[PDB]
Each structure stands twice: as C-alpha cells, then as structure tokens.
Amino acid sequence: DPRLYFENRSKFIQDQKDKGINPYPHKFERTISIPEFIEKYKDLGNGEHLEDTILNITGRIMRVSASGQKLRFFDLVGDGEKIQVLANYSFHNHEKGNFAECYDKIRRGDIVGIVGFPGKSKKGELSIFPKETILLSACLHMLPMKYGLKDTEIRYRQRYLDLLINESSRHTFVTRTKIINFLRNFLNERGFFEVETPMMNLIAGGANARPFITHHNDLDLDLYLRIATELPLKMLIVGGIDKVYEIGKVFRNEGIDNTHNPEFTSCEFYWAYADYNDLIKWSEDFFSQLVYHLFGTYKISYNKDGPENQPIEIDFTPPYPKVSIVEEIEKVTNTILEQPFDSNETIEKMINIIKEHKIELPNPPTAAKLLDQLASHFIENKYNDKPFFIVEHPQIMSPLAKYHRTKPGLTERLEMFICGKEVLNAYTELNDPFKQKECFKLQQKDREKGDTEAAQLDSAFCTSLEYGLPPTGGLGLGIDRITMFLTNKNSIKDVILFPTMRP
Amino acid sequence: DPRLYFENRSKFIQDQKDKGINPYPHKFERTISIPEFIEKYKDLGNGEHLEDTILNITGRIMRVSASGQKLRFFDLVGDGEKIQVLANYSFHNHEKGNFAECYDKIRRGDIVGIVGFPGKSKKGELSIFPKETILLSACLHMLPMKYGLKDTEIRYRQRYLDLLINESSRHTFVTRTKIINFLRNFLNERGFFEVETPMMNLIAGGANARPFITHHNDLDLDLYLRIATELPLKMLIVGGIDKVYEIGKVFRNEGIDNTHNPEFTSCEFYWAYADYNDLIKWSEDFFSQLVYHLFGTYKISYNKDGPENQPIEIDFTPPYPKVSIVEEIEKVTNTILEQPFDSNETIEKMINIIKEHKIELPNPPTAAKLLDQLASHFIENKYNDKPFFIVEHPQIMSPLAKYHRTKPGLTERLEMFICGKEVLNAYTELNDPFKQKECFKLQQKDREKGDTEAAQLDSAFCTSLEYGLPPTGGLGLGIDRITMFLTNKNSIKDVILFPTMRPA
Ligand SMILES: C[C@H]1CCC[C@H](C[C@H]2Cc3cc(O)cc(O)c3C(=O)N2)C1
Ligand SMILES: C[C@H]1CCC[C@H](C[C@H]2Cc3cc(O)cc(O)c3C(=O)N2)C1
Ligand SMILES: N[C@@H](CCCC[NH3+])C(=O)O
Ligand SMILES: N[C@@H](CCCC[NH3+])C(=O)O
C-alpha cells in the first residue's frame, strides 16, 4: 500500500511533466515566516479576517481534512511551529484553476506556497486563508504517524523523518547548539583563542585509544585520524598562544554503545600558568553556569533508567566532591595497593581483587588497565545526586600529566563524572621533556605486551617540549555526553544527528 | 653546534635537579599579563618607578644583555607583546638568592616568572624591575634570530618557532579566527542553525573529488572521510531545519600545492526558499562586509606574484561581474559547443580545442572534465582586480544543481573566483529525486570511463529527496583560500597551523 502510494505519486509527477507543468517550481518569494506570522496575528479576534493584507507563506502540510466540496482544512508547519490553513471556495482565485482540482492533489507532507490573508476561524484558530496554493515540492511517500516511529532505527537512519515527526528532537538539537555556543562564548570571554589542528597525523597521540588509519595516495603515506587534540595544542602553547582551544571531532576505533560513537565532539583548552586548582574551579564555574543558563536553576531531573522509569535529580550547585583514586579503591576493595604500582605484588593484588569480586579481567593485565577497571567498578558511581571528581591519578595511568607536587607517584589530574559517565579530563601538564620521554618509554613497554590502545611516541611533540612549555593547565570536555545529560537522553545516538549505525 | 648547545643545557637541567632546585616549578601565580601591563602603565612618567606596586608577571626571555654584573637587561615577551626587564642589584631580594647566580643562568628562550615593580627608563621604555626572577621552563635549543626563518620549511614543521619569532604569523592566524567568527555571527544573525554532520560516511558525496578511506574494526566496515557536507545538510532541510550550516574540515585525497591541503575548512549553508539570485546577493553582501569589517575599506592589496613583485588592488565593492561559462568559452575559442555537451561530436570538438592549444588533456577526457579544463585555461582569470562569478554551468558538470529555469542544459550555479582561484560554489539545489537519480546515473557512466572523481549514487540521499526537499539555495566557502587573500599569502601553508608536509 505504501509502495502503491509512492508509485501513484511518482506517476503524478511524470504526468505533470507531460501536461506541461514544472512540478518543482524554482522560486517562491515568501513575505513572512510561520513563527513571524504567529507572532504578528496571534491577537486577532474570533472570526476576524484581514482580507486586504495579502501574504506569501510557505510550509509543509502535516494534516489534511475537508468539510464538503468547498472547505479544505490543513495544518501547515514551519520552523517547529504550526498554523491552520483554511481554504474557502469563497476566497479562491478561480483564474488559477478549479478549486477542487487545486486542493485534491495536496497530500500530507507536501511543501506548499500560499498567497492569502490572515484571520481566525469561527473557533478562534489562527489561519492563513489561501486565495491560491501552489505545490512546491511533493512528498512522495506516506509519512509515519506521530507515534509510528517510536522504537525504530528509522530515527537514526532517516533523521529527517524524526525531525519532522518528533517535536522533542528539534528541541534536543537546539539545546546541543546552545551548549556549544555557550562554551565558545565562555572561553572567548576569558581571552581564549580558537584554532584548528590536523585531523590526520603521523601519530595519533594525546590519549590511550586505538586509532583509525587512512592513506594519502600522492604522498604514499599512511595517516592516523586524531584521537585527541592535546599534543598540537600544547605545541601552540610553546608557540606563545597562552590561552588556546579547539572544538571539533576526534576519532576512536573501538566499540559502539549508548555512550560511545566512533566520531565524537570534544573541546580541549590549554591555559598557560594555570594548574589543577584553576581547572577544578573552571569546571565548577562552567558547569554550574551552563546549567543555570539553560534551566534557570542548578538542579535538573534526568531519566537515568529510561523515560518509562523514575528519574533522578542532579544538583550542579558547586562545589562538587573530589575522590582520590588510589585510596578510594583501597577503602572499597578493603585492600591496600603497593608502593610501585607495577610491582608484581600490586599486579597480583589487583588481579585477585578483580577475581574476588568476579570483575572481568582485562587483557593484557597491565597496571594501568587494572587500575582503570578497578575505578570503573568501585568509584565511578559513588555519586548520582551531583557531579564529582576522581583526582590524583597515578603517573602510571597519566603519561602526560605533571607529577603531584606533594604525593610522589601520583599526578595533578581530575576527571569529572555525571551518573557514572566521564565528561571531563584535565590536569597540570607535564612539561619537563626529560620526564615526558620517560613516560613515553614506559608506554612503549606496555605496548610490548599487547596494549594496542597505548599511545605511540610523538617525536615532534617531544622536540617542542624541549623549547620550553610554560607551566600549563589543560582540560578536555566530552560534548556529546554533556548534551545527553542536559537534554534528558540515555543514548548518545539521540544527541548526534547522524550516529554511526550497523549498515 | 645546536647539538652541543642542547647538550650543555640538558646537563644544566640535570645538575639543577641534583642540587635540589626544581627547574620546572608547578605553579607561579601571575598578577597581570604583558599586554595588560603595557596598557596599564603606558602613561607612567619617564624615569618613574612604582616601588609600592609589587606585581607577578611571566613571559619568555627573548634578548639577554648586561652592563656588567649589577645591571641585567632582558626583553620579555608574552601574547605577542614585549616589555623590558631591568634587573638591578640594588633592588634584588638577596634573602632569596644570589643576584649574579640567578641571572647568569638565564638564557634566551627561557620562560620566567618575575616578582617586581613597574617603571620606565629615563628614555621612556616601559619595564618590569625584578626583586626576584624564577626560571619556570628552560629553552634547551638556540632559538633562531629575528630574521632566521626566511625560506625554510621550519615555519611549517615547527610552527611554534614561527609563532614566536615572526610577528606576522600570529597576525595571520588571528585574522583567520576573526574571519571564521565573523562568518559564524553573520549566519547566526540571519537565523541560521549550526550543526555537525558525520566525518565518515558509507558513501562520500557532495562534490567531485577522490576520497580518503578508513576502516572501523569492531563493525568491520569501510568508511570514507567526507569530501563535502552538502548531502546530510540537504537532508536536514528535508527535516525542516530551514536555515542550516556547518563549518569544519573536509578531506580530499589528491595532490598538494599552494592552494590544496588534503584537509581543509569549508563552510556550507542551506537556505530553504532561496535561489541562485539570493545566493549572488548573499555573496556580495558577505564579502564586501567581511572585507570592510577587517580593513575599514572595500579595497585590499594582494601580492599575486609574491613579495618580490608589485601587488595588485582587489576591490570588493559590489556588485561583482557574472560570466556565463559556456558562452565565454565559445567566445574565447570561437566555437559553438552544441548540446548535448556530452555527445561524441561535442567531446571531440572540445578535445580538438585542447590539442590545438597545447593544453594538457584531462584523463579520462569526459565532457565535464573537458569543460572544466577549458574554463581553467581560458576564463578563470577574466578579472583579477575584483572578485567575479562564473555562472550557469552545464548540468553535466553540476549533478546536484537545479536545471536552469530558462536556459536548457545549464543549471542555476555560481562560483566566485579571486585572482584565478575558486573560493565559493553555490546553486539552486536540485530537489527533484527523479532528476537527481538521472544525474547520478550520468556521473556513473563517467566513473566507468575512469573518472575516479565522479560522484557515486547515494540512494539514501535520493530517498530523502522523495520526502520533499523545499526549493532551496545552498552555498559553500573555502575558508583557507579566503584567509590567504585577506592575509596576503600565496600559499595555503601560511594560513594552516600544521599543514600536511612530506615526512622528513
Ligand atoms: C575529551 C575527553 C574528555 C572527557 C572524556 C571523554 C571521553 C570520550 C570517550 C569516548 C570514546 C569513544 O570510543 C567514543 C565516544 O563517544 C567517547 C566519548 O563520548 N567520550 C572525552
Ligand atoms: C567547499 C568548496 C566551495 C568553493 C570551492 C572550494 C574548493 C576547495 C578545493 C580543494 C581541494 C583540495 O584537494 C584541497 C583544498 O585545500 C581545496 C580548497 O582549498 N578548496 C571549497
Ligand atoms: N586529551 C585528553 C583531554 C585533555 C587532558 C588534559 N591535557 C583526553 O582525551 O581525555
Ligand atoms: N559541496 C559543494 C559546496 C556547496 C554547493 C551548493 N550546494 C562543494 O564541495 O563545492
């Protein structure tokens, strides 16, 4: 039946091309948008017409009805708002064609342009009253009904239908753009300078992830898509751009789930002469101010367990708690971790902690992977009422963070979590090139046991460190996850217009 | 020689560490920046000292001098600006360390923190007068001097050295960011909605270009890096986002030269219910307003032939000329190119023009590539002292542009050129799904002849069109080339922080 609908509508298009018409007119010159029309004529009175004011209006037909052969009613939508179309034979311009013939061909989904006047129906419904209605672009398929899209992957593979049908989706993506705008303005007002660094590099560094690989033909050179922006931005700090940032895509070649899309939008900034404490305060200020900006309050509700389940309240009122990674793992496990974290005493203790709690064993069982799994199991859901920081990660987990000024073995690192999900990662930057090559060599040793996601050594980066990187504080944001929490979405797929799908 | 210097300075660091001193302190709390200092104390009287005003300041030493063991002079730079440092034994805090011991070890390039007071030399030079100076981060290599970067690829391979040494580089990249901010605001003020579409797609469409390809391991799926943002943005128009745009990188897998970098920054916008004419007016409004915003005038100077030759003036006063591509090619070659343009007779005629003029023959010699080569050799430099549009391209060159409402075989398309280089490409959008499929079919015939840049059919896109794409006008800008002209650069490498280079 939809197949036959499509065939009949395609036949209509070809028949028009025969009869003479161009069924897709080039240009219709609109005088007012639908939101503007609503704003302007909202206050008309019941049944009042302004028959002398002729307006040119466009939009998409989303409902079709009739009352006899001389009254046609439509819903017309544009820019997320809707007016009524009231087509009365009494106002029809018969010089442009037979009334019935004009309106009988209009179908739900059709894009039209209307020459008419504003008014209210006898029931007070604000309407455009056409004197002529022109098909501008036909909808050749039947659109799904308001609720006939609910569980479908169609929302993600045919996002335009979702945007037409599900009123909330447009609101979600508006909020996403507002969040990004707020962030860009927040940084620009603080003296920060926005740049673009390469998406493709000889080495994909600045995080611990498996990269995408591609090939430039003319240079005959394999290139890696970036997993982070950290290394070139620090190079720009050496260059004297003392407050610098970048908002754009990065790429990680791993699994897809509700909180992972293979390309995702990050913001990283580098702030010369800042440190860990400045970054804690920046995070608290930014998040409290963003939430207040959007919602006029610091507390929001979030359906963590889905729309059909009870929601929780997340309080963004600062300050947020800070939990030190090592000693919280020590309390939770009831164990005490070792002096050198790589010690086979420590490694065995961590493996046996994972086994004593039936936690999945990482492979290879590197000290860093073990600490990470322990953290995700014993800490990352310590709070759901409030965001919170996991801090003071060991140097073993943090090859680019500066060593802690008073806690040997640890670094001045912070990660903010919302509802168990990481949205922020930041630290006092490691800037002694002699310790940095050290960390890179330890990472190469980890790669010598099967650690694929361990970052490769970047020689250009190390040379730049040798020219003097001032003490600096750097921070990264996960934009998509932030948007998920601020739009009440459970899946990253609901905040990305075209998420990566199984084909 | 540079190896010996780096050797000695690495040893200096190690020795500092042995002796307990940490040469990379964790945190120095600064009171004021160098530009803020310069603004704040600019009206200080010559010779005046504010000993009552202790400030913490940071920067990079860029010049070392002395008058001997009791006066040390330095240049200190930050955020592209510079002050003098006048370290006087008389003002040294001796309880924190020995004066000569502290200042003897400072080297050009070192990042320092200074506790001291502001003042002016008797000759009027704004200076910080240290009571204490702390090394924060040493420079272990000799920095090149003021004119040391002239013609090397050091500027492109170590951009940070370029940004430190050549003041003009920072100006260029500041202007780049200003141009993009201006564009974003220009569009947002007009109701436009910024979005992000995927960098990786099952089919790379939206332009005629060779793509990069990569693989997603977990899904075991080959993907193409996007060559344009056009197709998903039009899908968003179908979805009802009637003014939509994207600024970001796209990727093309072809040769590198002065106007081609394998990744470059484009802006594409889609404007429901607009057409070719609105897009011409938009282009004239945007370029004239951008230039006036940056320069306070509509006329700029551009060294088309490099710094050693006279520049030309480019006048961005609108309106700009419009040159119909087929008509201009016919006038220049004194030919008639009868339709259909991809007929065997017209292809042979075009090939014969190309051979008669010793122009290089496109491979394969499709009708569209022959048209493009004729235009490249014959008409794209018709104007140099002003931008201009080449308009009304044939359908066979323009598979996504709407058939021209009064000139059969052509489309409602415009490209803007500056000094022979394309910076803008726009048209009334093709919104008939049946015609769209026909166009993809033709492009595929060319693909089968060997055109690795012809567009491949995207059925998902054609399906979106079957739900009704309103009449729409779309436009793309090449941000990097625009920035080249507005910063007086001859190479795209001068407006990209880290341009793609052949490995060393
Ligand atoms: C810049 C950085 C700072 C805060 C933590 C984020 C992790 C990042 C991890 C990740 C992996 C992946 O394969 C796909 C994804 O979408 C994400 C994601 O959203 N966040 C981002
Ligand atoms: C969006 C579009 C609109 C106007 C024409 C520009 C062409 C585009 C062509 C190109 C190819 C390449 O492989 C490397 C490059 O840098 C460029 C470039 O800079 N501009 C961009
Ligand atoms: N590169 C980090 C974000 C910034 C960390 C601080 N320099 C990440 O991918 O998690
Ligand atoms: N996608 C085009 C720019 C937009 C043309 C108008 N839809 C290009 O890459 O040149």
Side-chain angles (χ1 to χ4, degrees), chain A residues 1-2 4-10 12-18 20 22-68 70-121 124-144 148-149 152-166 168-207 209-307 309-325 327-328 330 333 340-344 357 362-368 371-373 375-377 379-433 435-436 438-439 450 452 454-503, chain B residues 1-2 4-10 12-18 20 22-68 71-94 96-100 102-104 106-122 124 126-141 143-145 148-149 152-166 168-307 309 311-354 357 359-440 442-446 448 450-455 457-504:
Chain A
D1 171 57
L4 191 88
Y5 190 88
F6 175 81
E7 295 160 24
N8 277 32
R9 294 288 274 156
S10 312
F12 168 75
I13 294 289
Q14 189 61 72
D15 288 347
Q16 293 284 336
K17 279 168 197 172
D18 303 336
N22 164 27
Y24 295 97
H26 288 76
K27 169 78 180 170
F28 180 98
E29 192 73 273
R30 173 218 245 195
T31 53
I32 187 182
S33 82
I34 283 174
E36 285 158 9
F37 180 101
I38 284 166
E39 267 307 294
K40 206 185 214 74
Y41 302 110
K42 222 162 46 180
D43 296 314
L44 291 172
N46 222 277
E48 168 179 15
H49 300 171
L50 304 167
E51 296 190 6
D52 283 336
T53 71
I54 308 307
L55 310 161
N56 286 11
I57 273 63
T58 65
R60 191 184 289 273
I61 299 292
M62 291 304 279
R63 190 178 84 156
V64 168
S65 64
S67 161
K70 286 191 167 175
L71 282 166
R72 308 302 173 97
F73 304 93
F74 306 91
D75 285 357
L76 189 78
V77 306
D79 298 308
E81 307 191 42
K82 169 163 57 56
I83 57 168
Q84 228 62 31
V85 179
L86 206 171
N88 188 346
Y89 181 104
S90 314
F91 314 119
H92 180 63
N93 185 359
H94 310 295
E95 288 157 36
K96 300 289 198 163
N98 173 280
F99 181 74
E101 177 176 328
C102 288
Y103 288 100
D104 283 343
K105 51 173 170 255
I106 301 303
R107 304 289 192 252
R108 182 170 185 249
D110 282 350
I111 300 284
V112 300
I114 288 164
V115 181
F117 63 82
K120 263 150 180 198
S121 62
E125 284 183 301
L126 173 67
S127 313
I128 184 77
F129 291 75
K131 291 216 98 215
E132 103 174 77
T133 297
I134 298 165
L135 177 65
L136 298 176
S137 190
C139 186
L140 310 178
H141 301 277
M142 279 187 286
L143 283 171
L149 216 50
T152 74
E153 281 187 346
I154 283 73
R155 317 199 290 297
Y156 309 120
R157 313 171 171 280
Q158 287 179 280
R159 174 67 74 189
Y160 49 91
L161 297 182
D162 182 59
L163 291 168
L164 293 175
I165 298 306
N166 294 321
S168 76
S169 278
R170 168 177 205 111
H171 298 330
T172 294
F173 289 101
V174 169
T175 302
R176 181 195 174 93
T177 287
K178 282 184 199 305
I179 287 167
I180 299 182
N181 291 341
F182 182 92
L183 169 61
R184 172 173 286 111
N185 298 334
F186 191 92
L187 289 167
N188 284 357
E189 285 175 3
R190 276 149 187 90
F192 280 78
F193 187 72
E194 179 170 16
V195 303
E196 287 170 278
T197 63
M199 311 253 171
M200 314 175 154
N201 305 266
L202 306 160
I203 297 96
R210 168 168 66 179
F212 289 89
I213 192 94
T214 191
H215 190 73
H216 185 260
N217 293 5
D218 213 274
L219 288 179
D220 198 354
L221 174 62
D222 290 339
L223 297 168
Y224 300 70
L225 302 194
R226 61 180 188 196
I227 61 179
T229 47
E230 170 154 347
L231 302 187
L233 292 166
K234 253 176 283 193
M235 289 171 78
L236 294 174
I237 294 280
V238 181
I241 307 177
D242 279 352
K243 299 176 172 177
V244 66
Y245 75 100
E246 180 163 14
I247 309 179
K249 292 290 181 70
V250 297
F251 312 83
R252 295 181 187 180
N253 193 347
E254 63 215 12
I256 296 158
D257 58 24
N258 275 8
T259 54
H260 294 85
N261 191 75
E263 60 183 282
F264 63 90
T265 298
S266 83
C267 181
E268 293 193 28
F269 73 77
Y270 287 80
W271 181 8
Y273 312 112
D275 79 348
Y276 163 97
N277 307 103
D278 304 297
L279 296 170
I280 295 283
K281 169 167 199 296
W282 189 101
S283 305
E284 291 179 343
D285 289 341
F286 176 72
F287 273 88
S288 56
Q289 276 181 52
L290 169 62
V291 175
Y292 198 89
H293 176 77
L294 296 175
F295 301 93
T297 171
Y298 297 108
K299 313 180 179 199
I300 62 181
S301 68
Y302 178 69
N303 290 76
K304 178 173 187 195
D305 297 319
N309 287 307
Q310 205 154 284
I312 56 163
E313 187 184 79
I314 306 171
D315 181 7
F316 286 82
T317 305
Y320 310 147
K322 291 94 189 169
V323 198
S324 180
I325 185 49
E327 79 183 56
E328 178 77 13
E330 275 163 354
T333 54
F341 286 105
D342 44 19
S343 83
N344 263 318
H357 290 76
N363 194 8
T366 72
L371 292 172
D372 212 278
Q373 187 74 285
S376 43
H377 294 329
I379 303 195
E380 295 184 0
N381 279 282
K382 188 170 203 206
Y383 300 87
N384 282 179
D385 273 320
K386 56 194 65 193
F388 76 104
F389 295 104
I390 298 175
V391 312
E392 294 179 339
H393 303 61
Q395 192 89 72
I396 288 316
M397 308 177 69
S398 324
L400 302 146
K402 197 167 200 167
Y403 68 102
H404 201 294
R405 71 195 67 178
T406 200
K407 300 182 183 178
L410 311 188
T411 66
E412 323 198 331
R413 183 179 180 186
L414 56 140
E415 297 178 315
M416 215 191 67
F417 284 76
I418 301 170
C419 292
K421 307 302 173 190
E422 184 180 0
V423 303
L424 191 154
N425 180 38
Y427 34 80
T428 307
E429 301 300 327
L430 180 51
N431 65 331
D432 180 348
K435 323 204 188 74
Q436 181 67 95
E438 248 160 55
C439 295
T452 53
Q456 323 213 299
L457 172 131
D458 192 333
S459 63
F461 175 72
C462 281
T463 309
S464 77
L465 254 49
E466 289 164 5
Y467 283 87
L469 173 70
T472 297
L475 181 152
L477 290 171
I479 295 302
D480 308 291
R481 290 177 180 183
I482 293 170
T483 303
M484 291 174 56
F485 291 114
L486 297 189
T487 52
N488 199 21
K489 292 306 154 81
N490 303 96
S491 171
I492 201 173
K493 294 187 179 72
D494 294 317
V495 301
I496 293 162
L497 288 163
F498 305 89
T500 316
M501 305 293 289
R502 274 94 179 183
Chain B
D1 183 4
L4 303 186
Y5 185 99
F6 168 77
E7 182 135 359
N8 293 328
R9 289 282 276 163
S10 299
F12 165 80
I13 287 301
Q14 189 47 247
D15 289 358
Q16 288 282 325
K17 300 177 163 191
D18 298 350
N22 168 20
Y24 301 97
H26 281 76
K27 165 78 182 195
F28 182 91
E29 192 72 271
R30 179 171 99 165
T31 320
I32 189 168
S33 81
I34 286 188
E36 289 166 351
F37 184 99
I38 285 160
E39 254 309 291
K40 175 173 281 275
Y41 298 113
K42 67 178 198 220
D43 287 328
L44 217 51
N46 299 337
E48 216 141 39
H49 300 351
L50 302 184
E51 291 101 344
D52 65 349
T53 300
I54 299 305
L55 299 161
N56 292 5
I57 193 157
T58 61
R60 196 185 282 279
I61 299 292
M62 293 302 269
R63 185 183 197 277
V64 176
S65 316
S67 287
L71 257 64
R72 316 306 184 92
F73 303 74
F74 306 92
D75 288 358
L76 182 78
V77 316
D79 300 304
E81 305 188 33
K82 164 175 70 211
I83 57 163
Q84 292 3 95
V85 176
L86 211 155
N88 192 331
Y89 187 89
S90 290
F91 312 144
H92 182 69
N93 185 354
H94 306 284
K96 219 89 70 178
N98 185 270
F99 181 74
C102 155
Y103 287 97
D104 278 348
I106 295 307
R107 295 282 181 297
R108 178 170 186 259
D110 291 341
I111 287 153
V112 298
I114 284 161
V115 182
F117 59 85
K120 269 187 190 177
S121 72
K122 302 235 204 301
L126 191 53
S127 321
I128 185 77
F129 291 73
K131 285 230 97 205
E132 182 188 13
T133 296
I134 289 149
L135 171 70
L136 302 177
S137 190
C139 179
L140 311 177
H141 301 286
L143 282 164
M145 208 32 172
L149 273 306
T152 37
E153 320 177 310
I154 296 177
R155 290 175 297 120
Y156 305 140
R157 293 179 190 282
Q158 301 167 265
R159 174 66 74 182
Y160 46 91
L161 296 182
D162 184 46
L163 292 161
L164 289 173
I165 300 302
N166 297 315
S168 78
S169 302
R170 170 194 287 261
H171 195 258
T172 298
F173 289 99
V174 163
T175 299
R176 179 186 175 97
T177 293
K178 278 179 180 292
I179 288 167
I180 294 168
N181 290 346
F182 180 90
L183 175 58
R184 177 170 285 112
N185 179 78
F186 192 94
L187 289 170
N188 285 351
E189 289 181 357
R190 284 161 179 77
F192 277 76
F193 191 71
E194 183 176 8
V195 296
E196 292 171 85
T197 64
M199 311 273 261
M200 300 183 275
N201 298 277
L202 297 171
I203 295 167
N208 293 305
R210 249 180 322 282
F212 289 91
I213 169 154
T214 183
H215 183 81
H216 186 274
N217 296 9
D218 215 75
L219 277 177
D220 182 60
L221 180 65
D222 301 310
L223 296 157
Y224 297 98
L225 297 200
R226 72 188 188 185
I227 59 178
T229 49
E230 166 156 352
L231 297 201
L233 291 173
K234 258 181 283 197
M235 280 169 59
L236 294 176
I237 297 285
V238 177
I241 308 183
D242 283 349
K243 297 182 178 185
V244 66
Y245 74 103
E246 190 171 4
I247 308 173
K249 291 289 183 63
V250 300
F251 311 86
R252 290 174 195 191
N253 192 0
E254 48 218 33
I256 297 166
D257 63 23
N258 281 3
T259 53
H260 299 80
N261 194 75
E263 67 191 277
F264 59 96
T265 301
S266 76
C267 172
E268 293 197 30
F269 77 76
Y270 288 81
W271 184 4
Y273 308 105
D275 71 0
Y276 166 100
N277 301 113
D278 302 298
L279 299 173
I280 288 278
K281 184 196 189 305
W282 189 101
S283 305
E284 295 176 340
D285 286 340
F286 171 76
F287 275 89
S288 62
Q289 287 189 37
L290 170 62
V291 166
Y292 194 90
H293 170 78
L294 289 174
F295 302 102
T297 171
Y298 299 111
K299 299 173 183 175
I300 71 179
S301 189
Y302 185 68
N303 287 78
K304 177 180 58 173
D305 298 302
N309 292 311
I312 68 178
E313 172 199 280
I314 308 169
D315 185 0
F316 286 84
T317 308
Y320 308 149
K322 287 90 190 170
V323 173
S324 289
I325 170 172
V326 174
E327 179 171 345
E328 184 73 16
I329 291 170
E330 286 170 335
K331 297 201 302 223
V332 165
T333 67
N334 198 9
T335 200
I336 287 276
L337 302 167
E338 54 261 355
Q339 291 195 46
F341 296 116
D342 52 358
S343 76
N344 298 273
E345 287 83 27
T346 299
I347 285 180
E348 218 58 30
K349 178 179 300 199
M350 290 193 290
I351 282 168
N352 282 338
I353 298 167
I354 284 198
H357 290 80
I359 299 166
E360 91 155 37
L361 186 58
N363 187 81
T366 66
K369 302 225 306 172
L370 290 162
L371 283 164
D372 174 64
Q373 182 79 331
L374 285 174
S376 172
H377 283 71
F378 280 117
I379 79 177
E380 288 173 6
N381 284 281
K382 191 164 188 187
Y383 302 88
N384 271 200
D385 58 6
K386 51 175 67 68
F388 77 110
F389 301 103
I390 296 171
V391 298
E392 302 183 319
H393 303 70
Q395 188 80 72
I396 58 144
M397 312 178 67
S398 320
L400 296 157
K402 193 158 190 174
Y403 49 100
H404 190 298
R405 75 192 69 169
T406 55
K407 304 185 184 185
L410 315 181
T411 64
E412 314 198 331
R413 182 174 176 193
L414 52 146
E415 295 169 338
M416 213 183 70
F417 286 75
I418 308 175
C419 284
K421 312 302 181 177
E422 181 182 2
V423 307
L424 180 151
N425 181 30
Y427 36 81
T428 312
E429 299 299 332
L430 180 45
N431 64 337
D432 178 341
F434 177 88
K435 303 198 130 140
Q436 192 57 89
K437 246 179 266 194
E438 299 185 325
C439 287
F440 280 144
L442 267 198
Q443 291 283 300
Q444 251 284 331
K445 277 185 38 138
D446 281 354
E448 296 176 44
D451 187 357
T452 180
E453 305 188 310
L457 158 58
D458 188 328
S459 211
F461 174 71
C462 295
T463 292
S464 82
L465 257 46
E466 302 171 348
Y467 284 85
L469 171 61
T472 294
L475 180 153
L477 306 164
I479 299 302
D480 309 286
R481 291 172 176 187
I482 299 170
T483 301
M484 293 173 58
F485 294 112
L486 301 188
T487 58
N488 197 21
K489 298 303 170 187
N490 298 119
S491 164
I492 198 172
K493 298 189 181 73
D494 293 316
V495 307
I496 296 176
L497 283 167
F498 300 95
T500 326
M501 305 288 287
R502 200 176 251 111

